[PDB]
Nucleic acid binder design. Sequence first.
DNA 1: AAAAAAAGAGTTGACACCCGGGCGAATCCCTGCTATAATGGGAGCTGTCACGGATGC
Length: 60
Amino acid sequence: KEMVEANLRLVISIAKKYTNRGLQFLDLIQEGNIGLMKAVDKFEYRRGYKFSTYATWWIR
DNA sequence: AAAAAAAGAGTTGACACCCGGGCGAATCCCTGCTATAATGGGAGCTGTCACGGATGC
């Protein structure tokens, strides 16, 4: 929960690009939060040492 | 003065067929997985009053 709350503002930058496509802003933010919470479960010390590099794919 | 049959019924086999139910095969929907660094948002009035009511000290 702490890790998903620390990177909560990262999804707002990705959700801003997708707009006026049939979904409101809050719904897109909630979907991005779902994706981020689903991506935080699997994160090891792989080639990508930044959590954002692995979370952006799941959020998108 | 008499007396039997084309229809009218009644069937009996003989196809023609027409969707139904399976056997296939070919092909749709779902779901998840991608590893360099991405880190707070874009309209909208604002050129009608007037009434009738709801908060505040």
